[PDB]
Amino acid sequence: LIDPRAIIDPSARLAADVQVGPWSIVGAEVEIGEGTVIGPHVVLKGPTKIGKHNRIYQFSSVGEDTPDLKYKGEPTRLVIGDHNVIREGVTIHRGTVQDRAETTIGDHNLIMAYAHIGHDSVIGNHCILVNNTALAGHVHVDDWAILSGYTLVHQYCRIGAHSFSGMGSAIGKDVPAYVTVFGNPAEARSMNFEGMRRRGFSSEAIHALRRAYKVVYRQGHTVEEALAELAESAAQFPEVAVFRDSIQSATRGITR
Amino acid sequence: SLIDPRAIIDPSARLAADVQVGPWSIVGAEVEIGEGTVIGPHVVLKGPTKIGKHNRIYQFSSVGEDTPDLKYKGEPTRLVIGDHNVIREGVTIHRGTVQDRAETTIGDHNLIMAYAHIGHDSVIGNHCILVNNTALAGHVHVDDWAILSGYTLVHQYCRIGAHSFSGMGSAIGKDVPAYVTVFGNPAEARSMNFEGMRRRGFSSEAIHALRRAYKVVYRQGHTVEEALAELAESAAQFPEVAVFRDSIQSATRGITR
Amino acid sequence: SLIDPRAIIDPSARLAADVQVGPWSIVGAEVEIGEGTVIGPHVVLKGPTKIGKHNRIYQFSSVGEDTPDLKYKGEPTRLVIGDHNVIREGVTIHRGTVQDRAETTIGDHNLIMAYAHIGHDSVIGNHCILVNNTALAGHVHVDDWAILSGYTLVHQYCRIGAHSFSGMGSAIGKDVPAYVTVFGNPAEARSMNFEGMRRRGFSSEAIHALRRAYKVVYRQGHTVEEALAELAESAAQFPEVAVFRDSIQSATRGITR
Ligand SMILES: CC1(C)CN([C@]2(C(=O)Nc3nnn[nH]3)CN(C(=O)c3cccc(C(F)(F)F)c3)c3ccccc32)C(=O)O1
Ligand SMILES: CC1(C)CN([C@]2(C(=O)Nc3nnn[nH]3)CN(C(=O)c3cccc(C(F)(F)F)c3)c3ccccc32)C(=O)O1
Ligand SMILES: CC1(C)CN([C@]2(C(=O)Nc3nnn[nH]3)CN(C(=O)c3cccc(C(F)(F)F)c3)c3ccccc32)C(=O)O1
Ligand SMILES: CC1(C)CN([C@]2(C(=O)Nc3nnn[nH]3)CN(C(=O)c3cccc(C(F)(F)F)c3)c3ccccc32)C(=O)O1
Numbered sequence: 115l116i117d118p119r120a121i122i123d124p125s126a127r128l129a130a131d132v133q134v135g136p137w138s139i140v141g142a143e144v145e146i147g148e149g150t151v152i153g154p155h156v157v158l159k160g161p162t163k164i165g166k167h168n169r170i171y172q173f174s175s176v177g178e179d180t181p182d183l184k185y186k187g188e189p190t191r192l193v194i195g196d197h198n199v200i201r202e203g204v205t206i207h208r209g210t211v212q213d214r215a216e217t218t219i220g221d222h223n224l225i226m227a228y229a230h231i232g233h234d235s236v237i238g239n240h241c242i243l244v245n246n247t248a249l250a251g252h253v254h255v256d257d258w259a260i261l262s263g264y265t266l267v268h269q270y271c272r273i274g275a276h277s278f279s280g281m282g283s284a285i286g287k288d289v290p291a292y293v294t295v296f297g298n299p300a301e302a303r304s305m306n307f308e309g310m311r312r313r314g315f316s317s318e319a320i321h322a323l324r325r326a327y328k329v330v331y332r333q334g335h336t337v338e339e340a341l342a343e344l345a346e347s348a349a350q351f352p353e354v355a356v357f358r359d360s361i362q363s364a365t366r367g368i369t370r
Numbered sequence: 371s372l373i374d375p376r377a378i379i380d381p382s383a384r385l386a387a388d389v390q391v392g393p394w395s396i397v398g399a400e401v402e403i404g405e406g407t408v409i410g411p412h413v414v415l416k417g418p419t420k421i422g423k424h425n426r427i428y429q430f431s432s433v434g435e436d437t438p439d440l441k442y443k444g445e446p447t448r449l450v451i452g453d454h455n456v457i458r459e460g461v462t463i464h465r466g467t468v469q470d471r472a473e474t475t476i477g478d479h480n481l482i483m484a485y486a487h488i489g490h491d492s493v494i495g496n497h498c499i500l501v502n503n504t505a506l507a508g509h510v511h512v513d514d515w516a517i518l519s520g521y522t523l524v525h526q527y528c529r530i531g532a533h534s535f536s537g538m539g540s541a542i543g544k545d546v547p548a549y550v551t552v553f554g555n556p557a558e559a560r561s562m563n564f565e566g567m568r569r570r571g572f573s574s575e576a577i578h579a580l581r582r583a584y585k586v587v588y589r590q591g592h593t594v595e596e597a598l599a600e601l602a603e604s605a606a607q608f609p610e611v612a613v614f615r616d617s618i619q620s621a622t623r624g625i626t627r
Numbered sequence: 628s629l630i631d632p633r634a635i636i637d638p639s640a641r642l643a644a645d646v647q648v649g650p651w652s653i654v655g656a657e658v659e660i661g662e663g664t665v666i667g668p669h670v671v672l673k674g675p676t677k678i679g680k681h682n683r684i685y686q687f688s689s690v691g692e693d694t695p696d697l698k699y700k701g702e703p704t705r706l707v708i709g710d711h712n713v714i715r716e717g718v719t720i721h722r723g724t725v726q727d728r729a730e731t732t733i734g735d736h737n738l739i740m741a742y743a744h745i746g747h748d749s750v751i752g753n754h755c756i757l758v759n760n761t762a763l764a765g766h767v768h769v770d771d772w773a774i775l776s777g778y779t780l781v782h783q784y785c786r787i788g789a790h791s792f793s794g795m796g797s798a799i800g801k802d803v804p805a806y807v808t809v810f811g812n813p814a815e816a817r818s819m820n821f822e823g824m825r826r827r828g829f830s831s832e833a834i835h836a837l838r839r840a841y842k843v844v845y846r847q848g849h850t851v852e853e854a855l856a857e858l859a860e861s862a863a864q865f866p867e868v869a870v871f872r873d874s875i876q877s878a879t880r881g882i883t884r
Contacts, residue, residue, distance in 0.1 A: 155687075173412075202462055203485075203742075228485060228742060230741060248777050263507070264503075298811065412669060428692070430689075458695055502762055
């Protein structure tokens with residue numbers, strides 16, 4: 115289960131059915147939960163906590179220090195939840211003290227080859243980061259979001275739930291929930307109706323979100339004006355409230 | 371032949387004469403390696419996979435992994451690499467899926483540069499160059515002598531024409547006709563690869579005929595049906611123009627404009 | 628001790644006494660490593676290659692490989708890295724070609740972040756930052772304090788000026804003058820790096836001269852001939868406008884506009 119060619123630090127805690135492949139390093143203060151398979155040629159650094167039924171593939175560096183010139187060796191953390199797939203050559207950096215000292219990943223996330231998750235980023239659940247997606251730092255990715263290949267995200271951006279970025283997008287402003295963005299710089303194109311159908315949203319909820327999109331994007335309304343007008347629809351449909359909350363929380367401005 | 375003793379060779383693996391495997395490489399079950407093939411250190415080969423003769427695979431490459439795109443993998447799906455290919459550092463090459471071809475296929479004399487990605491069910495021909503960080507999403511067909519420049523991204527189901535050229539950072543969502551130069555995200559057709567035609571020793575008359583073939587398709591407001599009819603005489607006279615005409619006729623889902 | 632027993636050190640390797648080499652790393656023939664330098668695990672160092680003092684090279688880096696460029700034919704070419712450099716996860720640095728000066732050179736205090744690529748015959752200065760996935764095609768000159776943000780792509784023979792800044796996803800095909808800010812694919816000149824200069828301790832007067840300098844080249848309709856003339860005067864009063872004027876003089880590919 116633990117390959118003999120692997121290096122397991124004395125201070126690392128592993129669960130019973132944890133598999134570690136050859137030429138992998140499990141460093142000091144790395145906990146790894148039940149059902150988790152660490153491939154060959156993985157480097158894990160701590161303090162890091164990994165959940166259960168996770169798969170980390172070869173040439174991944176999970177829990178390295180950020181090279182960000184404001185980090186200075188503080189004992190910052192990385193937390194990964196359950197049922198995640200981290201593919202080949204992914205880099206995940208621990209938090210910085212300037213902002214909560216923790217990088218967090220939720221459950222059922224799929225982080226494809228050579229993706230980069232920067233210091234202090236927060237991923238939710240059921241997210242897909244396609245190959246070479248890069249989160250600069252302090253990026254919040256809400257549940258069910260899809261960032262397509264080579265999507266670049268500037269520090270401090272919020273990517274809303276069920277949002278979609280096109281391949282090679284460069285995001286500089288918050289992406290609201292359900293919104294589709296494309297290009298460098300990314301600009302909003304529509305709502306992720308496909309994404310909503312893929313979760314059996316009530317058709318009334320899809321029609322409600324289509325209306326909400328128009329209130330914000332296609333009616334010359336200011337953000338305050340749009341939020342005001344979304345109030346009733348929000349209180350009526352919890353689906354619309356996610357959208358409403360994602361704009362309200364974006365006082366860095368929204369991706370247009 | 372030199373098999374590094376720090377390598378892991380699965381007992382079901384088959385190595386031909388003069389195969390080298392560097393330290394800390396894995397040749398997994400049902401991997402066949404052809405004569406004179408050099409596997410570097412830190413390579414992961416997974417099967418079922420057939421690699422031909424006189425290949426070179428560099429460190430940190432993962433060759434014959436399963437696509438992450440399916441949660442519940444099907445087997446058997448295959449990867450076939452031919453002869454005299456160079457696969458540089460960190461390249462990822464996924465096997466096929468049961469849904470579709472069940473096989474990812476690379477021909478001969480290809481150069482796949484560092485951190486390139488070849489997705490499931492893709493088909494590469496001969497004498498192609500995929501520059502660093504080129505990414506084929508899946509079901510991509512790259513025909514002979516095509517050059518994808520650095521950080522080219524190709525949507526699933528796209529055909530990249532023979533002797534075509536994509537500029538660095540291009541994102542291709544439609545078929546690229548043979549010989550055409552494309553640039554941008556999203557990719558736009560700019561001109562023809564006249565440089566490659568000359569480098570490959572095409573005649574000035576074939577080059578001139580292809581310069582006119584481009585104008586017929588792109589600059590005269592013809593339906594593709596009408597462009598194809600306008601090219602039929604040129605295509606009959608020049609096999610190089612028939613390759614162009616064929617790549618346009620085979621593009622049911624439209625060409626990069 | 629300091630050399631991990633699981634590392635491979637070639638007999639013809641010269642390591643200073645306090646040099647750390649982590650497990651499953653290779654130090655190839657004719658690799659020289661200077662005092663203080665820490666080599667991580669799973670690193671491949673190939674020669675002939677000189678690494679200076681107090682360097683740090685992270686896992687999955689390939690430092691000193693041959694270029695795949697078809698114009699290299701196995702000649703004895705080198706790589707030189709200076710002191711106090713940080714090379715992160717998965718970086719690729721290729722050695723020179725005989726067609727230039729047979730050397731790839733890196734200076735001191737450089738930060739080269741994950742999966743960056745430094746191609747054959749590139750020369751990096753001092754205090755540069757190459758963010759994740761930056762790619763220099765080859766013969767690229769990056770001057771001191773340049774920052775290339777993530778996924779910056781640089782065409783061969785391009786010069787990146789001192790104190791310049793390239794935005795995420797930039798694709799540079801023409802020289803970037805010193806102090807200039809560029810964004811986009813293709814790259815576009817979008818003023819000068821005033822924030823970097825102010826923080827670097829440049830004088831109010833130098834910044835003001837540079838603003839007029841920028842107008843001379845970019846906003847007055849002058850040619851490079853014309854504009855270089857017009858800078859002479861200011862180039863005398865300030866070193867900075869000299870560095871700027873020099874960057875425009877040496878621009879063999881034209882300048883980013
Ligand atoms: C089946 C499908 C419709 C899905 N798809 C995928 C795609 O990138 N579509 C797209 N993005 N931006 N504009 N279009 C690729 N895909 C992928 O995950 C994929 C895998 C490797 C490389 C890449 C690339 F080229 F972008 F670097 C992508 C995926 C993942 C989630 C959602 C959609 C798509 C695609 O290309 O065809
Ligand atoms: C290709 C696939 C069968 C799988 N898939 C994807 C998915 O998120 N499935 C899922 N939903 N809920 N739980 N799992 C999203 N996806 C996709 O590739 C995808 C394709 C077209 C359009 C879109 C959308 F909604 F964003 F416009 C996405 C992908 C890529 C890799 C792995 C899994 C999946 C999907 O929707 O169809
Ligand atoms: C000598 C040459 C004329 C060729 N060339 C190369 C190039 O990228 N040209 C180009 N791309 N997009 N637009 N033009 C790079 N090159 C390369 O192989 C190369 C290597 C590393 C990184 C990159 C980059 F920058 F694109 F990420 C490229 C190559 C390979 C085949 C054909 C042409 C070119 C180049 O830059 O100068
Ligand atoms: C703190 C900061 C203002 C700086 N910054 C950084 C950035 O790339 N800014 C930027 N690029 N183009 N337009 N803006 C990211 N950053 C980084 O080094 C960084 C780290 C990981 C990934 C990336 C990405 F996604 F672009 F690949 C970048 C850095 C390094 C030096 C200077 C500025 C910035 C950023 O996003 O927030």
